[PDB]
Structure 1
């Protein structure tokens, strides 16, 4: 009778690793098909409840397990930084993520992984 027992619960298609730092120890977050919101809010797929992370910081959209995730910043206060090539990602502008790609949300360094590597 549970809500989740009715549904097709789709397995994770990727992983976001967060490196250890002033905010705490390393952590892995499962990423799913669709919109993975990165943000401070408790409901976010990648919930990073640090005061420097925007309530809705960024979004990693995964359309297919054979297509590159699409990263975009949601007009976060402290920005989203990519390194391919290095630059602050302007709100709305999509960035396709490669396996092992490194990104910063505010001062939190993260690395995206496929699951077939």
Structure 2
């Protein structure tokens, strides 16, 4: 049923966790209603989104106007609001200071 998963490494925020990613918009945010719920003060209510349109198309990551930002490593930079970034299998990203890794299932 899920197309991918997002792994959030253990850190200053607490223990490791994994989140399934589905077709459609997967919201990353502080609230429990988010697909990727990260209840930490540095994470915005609607922080970012990972949109998956098809099983065989790369997910697209966007920042939603978050306070503390989203960072990519291809190339290393802050991903500004509204700019699309296509994720590759095993790609690492940061939401505020939280390191995450995307896995295609």
> Residue 99 of structure 2 aligns with which residue?
109
Residues 66-109 of structure 1 show CA distances to partners (whole Å, capped at 9, x for unaligned) of 00000000010000000000000010000000000000000100
The alignment's TM-score, normalised by the length of structure 1, stands at 0.89
Residues 3-41 of structure 1 show CA distances to partners (whole Å, capped at 9, x for unaligned) of xxxxxxxx1110000000011111110000000000001
| Aligned equivalents of 1:71, 1:92: Cα separation in 2 | 10
User: Does structure 1 residue 30 correspond to structure 2 residue 33?
Assistant: no
The alignment's TM-score, normalised by the length of structure 2, stands at 0.99
Higher RCO, 1 vs 2 (CA within 8 Å, ≥6 residues apart):
2
| Aligned equivalents of 1:65, 1:105: Cα separation in 2 | 24
Moved over 4 A (4+): none
Residue segments in structure 2 that go unaligned for 5+ positions in a row: none
Larger radius of gyration: 1
Which one has the bigger strand percentage?
2
| Aligned equivalents of 1:99, 1:42: Cα separation in 2 | 26
| Aligned equivalents of 1:107, 1:39: Cα separation in 2 | 14
Residue segments in structure 1 that go unaligned for 5+ positions in a row: 1-10
